[PDB]
XYZ file of C-alpha atoms in Angstrom:
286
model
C -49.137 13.024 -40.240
C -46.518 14.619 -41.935
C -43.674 14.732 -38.649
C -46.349 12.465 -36.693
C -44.212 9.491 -36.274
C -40.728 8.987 -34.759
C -38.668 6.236 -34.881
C -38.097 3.863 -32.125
C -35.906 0.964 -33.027
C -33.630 1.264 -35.998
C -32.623 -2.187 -37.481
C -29.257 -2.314 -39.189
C -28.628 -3.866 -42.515
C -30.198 -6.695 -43.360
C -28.943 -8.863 -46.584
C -30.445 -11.703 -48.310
C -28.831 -14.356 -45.934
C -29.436 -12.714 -42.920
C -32.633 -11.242 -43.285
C -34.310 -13.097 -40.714
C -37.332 -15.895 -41.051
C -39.202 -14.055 -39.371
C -39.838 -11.532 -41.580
C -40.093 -13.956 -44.336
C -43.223 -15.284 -43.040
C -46.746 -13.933 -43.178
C -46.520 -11.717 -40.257
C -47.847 -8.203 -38.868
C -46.646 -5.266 -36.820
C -49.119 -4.757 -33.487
C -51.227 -2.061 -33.464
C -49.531 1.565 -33.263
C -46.132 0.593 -35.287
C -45.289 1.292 -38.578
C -42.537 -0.130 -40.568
C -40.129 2.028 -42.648
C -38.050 -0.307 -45.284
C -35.274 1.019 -47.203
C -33.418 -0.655 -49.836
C -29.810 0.604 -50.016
C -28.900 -2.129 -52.802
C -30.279 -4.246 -54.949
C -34.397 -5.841 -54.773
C -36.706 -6.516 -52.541
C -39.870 -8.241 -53.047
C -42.359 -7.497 -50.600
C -45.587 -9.776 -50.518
C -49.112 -8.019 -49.498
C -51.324 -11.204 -47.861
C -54.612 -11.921 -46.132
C -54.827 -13.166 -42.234
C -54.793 -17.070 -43.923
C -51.899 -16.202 -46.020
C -52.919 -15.170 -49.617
C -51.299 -13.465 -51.417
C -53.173 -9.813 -52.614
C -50.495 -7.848 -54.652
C -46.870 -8.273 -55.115
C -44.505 -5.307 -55.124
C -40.588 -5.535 -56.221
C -38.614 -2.321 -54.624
C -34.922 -0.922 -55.297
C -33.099 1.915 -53.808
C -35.011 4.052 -56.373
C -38.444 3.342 -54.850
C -39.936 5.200 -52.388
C -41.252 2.448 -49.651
C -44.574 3.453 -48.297
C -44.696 3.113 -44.126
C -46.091 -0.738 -43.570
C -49.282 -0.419 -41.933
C -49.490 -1.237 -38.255
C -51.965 -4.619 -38.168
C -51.079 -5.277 -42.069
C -50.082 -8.903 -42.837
C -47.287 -9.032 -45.131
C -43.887 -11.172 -45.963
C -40.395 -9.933 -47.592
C -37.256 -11.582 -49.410
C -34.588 -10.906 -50.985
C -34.697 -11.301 -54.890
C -31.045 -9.971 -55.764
C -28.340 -11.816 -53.681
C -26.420 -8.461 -53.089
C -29.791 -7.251 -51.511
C -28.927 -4.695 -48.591
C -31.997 -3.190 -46.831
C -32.767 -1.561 -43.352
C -36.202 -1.681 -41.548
C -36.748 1.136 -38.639
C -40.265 1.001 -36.126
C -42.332 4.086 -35.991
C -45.137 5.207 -33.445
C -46.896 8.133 -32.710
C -44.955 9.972 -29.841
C -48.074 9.226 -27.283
C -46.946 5.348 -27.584
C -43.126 5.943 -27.943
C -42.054 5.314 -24.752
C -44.178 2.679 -23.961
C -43.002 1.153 -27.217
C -39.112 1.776 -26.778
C -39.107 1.104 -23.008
C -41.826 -0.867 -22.219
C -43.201 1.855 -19.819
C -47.288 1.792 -18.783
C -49.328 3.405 -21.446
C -49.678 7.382 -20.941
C -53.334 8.477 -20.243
C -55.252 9.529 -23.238
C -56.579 12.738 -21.017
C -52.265 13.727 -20.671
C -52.351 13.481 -24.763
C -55.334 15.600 -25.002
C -54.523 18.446 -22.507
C -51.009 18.590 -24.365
C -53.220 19.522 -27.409
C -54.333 22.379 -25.702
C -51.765 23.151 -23.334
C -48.777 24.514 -25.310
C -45.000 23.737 -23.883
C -44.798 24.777 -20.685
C -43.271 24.424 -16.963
C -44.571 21.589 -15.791
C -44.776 19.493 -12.655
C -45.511 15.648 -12.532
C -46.622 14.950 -8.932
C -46.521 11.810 -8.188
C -44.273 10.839 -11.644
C -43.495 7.060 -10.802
C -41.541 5.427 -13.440
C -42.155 8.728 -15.333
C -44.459 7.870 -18.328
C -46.039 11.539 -18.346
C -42.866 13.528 -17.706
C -40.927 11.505 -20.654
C -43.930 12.067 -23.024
C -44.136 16.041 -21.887
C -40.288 16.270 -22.260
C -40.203 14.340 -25.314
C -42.653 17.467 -26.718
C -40.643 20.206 -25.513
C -42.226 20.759 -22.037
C -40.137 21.759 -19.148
C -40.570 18.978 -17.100
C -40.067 18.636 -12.863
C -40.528 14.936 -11.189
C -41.055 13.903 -8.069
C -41.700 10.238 -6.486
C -40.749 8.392 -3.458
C -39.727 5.245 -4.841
C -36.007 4.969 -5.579
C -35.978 2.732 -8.397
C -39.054 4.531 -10.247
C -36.718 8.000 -10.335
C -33.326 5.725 -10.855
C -35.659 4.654 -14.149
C -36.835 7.893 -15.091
C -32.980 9.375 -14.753
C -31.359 6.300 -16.334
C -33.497 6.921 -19.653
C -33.818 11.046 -19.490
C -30.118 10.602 -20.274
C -30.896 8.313 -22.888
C -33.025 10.541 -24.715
C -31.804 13.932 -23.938
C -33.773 15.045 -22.298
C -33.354 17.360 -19.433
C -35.626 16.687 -16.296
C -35.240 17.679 -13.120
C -35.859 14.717 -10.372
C -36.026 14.190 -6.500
C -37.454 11.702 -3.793
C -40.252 13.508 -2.152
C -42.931 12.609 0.219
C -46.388 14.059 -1.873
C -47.865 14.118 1.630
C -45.646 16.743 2.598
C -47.239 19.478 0.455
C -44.172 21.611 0.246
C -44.129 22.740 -3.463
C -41.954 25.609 -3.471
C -41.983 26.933 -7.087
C -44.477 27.955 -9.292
C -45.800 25.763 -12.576
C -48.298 26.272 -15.546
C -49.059 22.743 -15.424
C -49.837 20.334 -12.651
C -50.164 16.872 -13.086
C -50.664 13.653 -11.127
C -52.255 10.898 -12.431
C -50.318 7.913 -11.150
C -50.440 7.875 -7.494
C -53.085 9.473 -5.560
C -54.968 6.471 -4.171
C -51.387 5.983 -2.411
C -51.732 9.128 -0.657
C -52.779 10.056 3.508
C -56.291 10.594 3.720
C -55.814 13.764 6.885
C -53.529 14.811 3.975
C -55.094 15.684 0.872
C -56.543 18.808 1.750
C -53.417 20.324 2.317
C -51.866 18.688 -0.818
C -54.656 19.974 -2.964
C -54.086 23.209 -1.490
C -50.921 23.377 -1.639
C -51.193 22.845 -5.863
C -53.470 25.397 -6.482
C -51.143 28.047 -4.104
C -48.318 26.905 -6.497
C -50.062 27.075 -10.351
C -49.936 30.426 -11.886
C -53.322 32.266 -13.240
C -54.305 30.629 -16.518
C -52.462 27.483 -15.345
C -53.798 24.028 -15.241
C -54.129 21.051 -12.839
C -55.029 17.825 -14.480
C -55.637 14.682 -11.662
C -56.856 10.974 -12.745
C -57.330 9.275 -9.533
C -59.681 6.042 -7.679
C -63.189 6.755 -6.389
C -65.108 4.535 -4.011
C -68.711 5.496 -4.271
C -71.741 4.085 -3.064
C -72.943 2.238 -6.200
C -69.200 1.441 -7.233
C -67.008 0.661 -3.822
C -63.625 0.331 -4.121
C -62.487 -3.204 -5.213
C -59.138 -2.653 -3.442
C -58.477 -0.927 -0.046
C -56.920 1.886 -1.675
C -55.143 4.194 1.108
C -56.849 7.105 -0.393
C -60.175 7.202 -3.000
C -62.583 10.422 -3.855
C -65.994 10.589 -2.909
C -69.220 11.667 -5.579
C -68.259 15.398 -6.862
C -65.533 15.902 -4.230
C -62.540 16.709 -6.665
C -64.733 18.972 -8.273
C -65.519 20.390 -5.013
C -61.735 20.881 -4.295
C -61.791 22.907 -7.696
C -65.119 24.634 -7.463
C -63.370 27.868 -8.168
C -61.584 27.240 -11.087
C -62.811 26.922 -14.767
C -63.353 23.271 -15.715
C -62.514 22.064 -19.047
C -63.069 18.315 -18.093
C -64.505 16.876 -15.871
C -65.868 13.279 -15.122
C -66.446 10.215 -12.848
C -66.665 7.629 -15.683
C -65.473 3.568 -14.933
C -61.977 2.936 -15.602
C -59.947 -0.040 -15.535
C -56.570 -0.284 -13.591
C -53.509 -2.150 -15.794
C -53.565 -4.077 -13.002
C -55.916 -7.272 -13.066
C -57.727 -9.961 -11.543
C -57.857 -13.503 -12.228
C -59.433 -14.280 -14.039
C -57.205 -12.233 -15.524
C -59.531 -8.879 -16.203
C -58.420 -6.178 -15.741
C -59.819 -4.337 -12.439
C -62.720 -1.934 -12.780
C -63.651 1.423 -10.800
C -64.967 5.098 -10.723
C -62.391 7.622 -11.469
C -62.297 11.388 -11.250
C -60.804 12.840 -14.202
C -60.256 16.300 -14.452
C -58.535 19.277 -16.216
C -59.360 22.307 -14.638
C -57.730 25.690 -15.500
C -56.900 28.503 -12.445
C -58.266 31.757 -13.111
């Protein structure tokens, strides 16, 4: 964990008047944020509690102390004991949930996190980017990253906070049915979009991939199934059948591959979220 975490909101000083209620009350962080506190002048007392309020351990910290991260889920309360108290507080995540954390963006796939384990930094291609979730993540790590949607305001987004962030991505409006990739990339990925795709048109899109990933490249594609035990629930433009992305990649070596049930951010109401097949896959050209 040692450069696991990055920052993602840095407060500014906080002092004994302004500190705010908030954090004066029992309260946690949600689940993937950590909480770096820093005192920069005088003391801090910093109450450890139970979810009904109790109080477990006490700690008092000064700007010798060395603040261990707060705990993501961990129910705590702070004050000021000194009146010249002067103390900052920064949020922390794992870079998998920063952007989703700093900008509110859909969570990445877990599948994108894991084939960044094994794919090193690399030229990559987000097909079908949308608001850009995997090619911020990707760039964030040092990947070469090239994105392409239709939708205006999804690559106005995705340009709007690469400047942000410095990072340097290279964007355009493009119809995916076209299947005119012109370069070549070590990674191919499109997880976001491919239920919105022309039916007479995936073939040549498919195609058109594998023509344009180098040998020991990869191609990694989430996307809807409709099956006969598990029909679409939505009349998706576009949805693979039983074992046909697999079919697409017969040739290539697979290093995942699966039709498990999914759920869709999206929901019903209820207010579940909606379930289907997916195909998930990671395959490697050889």
């Amino acid at each position: 964990m040692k450069n696991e975490l990055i920052c993602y909101k840095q407060m500014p000083v906080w002092t004994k008047d302004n500190l705010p209620q908030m954090f004066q009350e029992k309260h946690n962080t949600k689940v993937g944020t950590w909480g770096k506190l820093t005192v920069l002048k005088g003391k801090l007392k910093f109450y450890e509690l139970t979810e009904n309020g109790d109080v477990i351990a006490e700690h008092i910290f000064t700007p010798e102390s060395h603040i261990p991260f707060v705990e993501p889920q961990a129910w705590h309360r702070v004050e000021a004991l000194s009146d010249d108290l002067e103390c900052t507080l920064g949020f922390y995540c794992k870079k998998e949930d920063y952007f989703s954390k700093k900008y509110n963006t859909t969570a990445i796939h877990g599948d994108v996190v894991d084939a960044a384990k094994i794919i090193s930094p690399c030229k990559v291609l987000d097909l079908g980017c949308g608001q850009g979730r995997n090619s911020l993540y990707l760039s964030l790590l040092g990947y070469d990253v090239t994105s392409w949607d239709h939708n205006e305001n999804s690559i106005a987004f995705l340009n709007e906070t690469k400047e942000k962030e410095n990072l340097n991505i290279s964007t355009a409006l493009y119809d995916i049915n076209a299947a005119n990739i012109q370069e070549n990339y070590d990674f191919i990925v499109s997880t976001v979009v491919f239920m919105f795709l022309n039916r007479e048109r995936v073939p040549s899109i498919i195609k058109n991939m594998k023509e344009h990933t180098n040998v020991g490249g990869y191609n990694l594609i989430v996307a809807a199934m409709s099956t006969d035990d598990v029909p679409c629930p939505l009349p998706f433009s576009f949805t693979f059948a039983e074992n046909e992305l697999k079919e697409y990649y017969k040739d290539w070596e697979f290093l995942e591959y699966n039709e498990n049930m999914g759920e869709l951010h999206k929901t019903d109401e209820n207010g579940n979220r909606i379930k289907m097949k997916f195909a998930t896959m990671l395959a490697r050209k050889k």
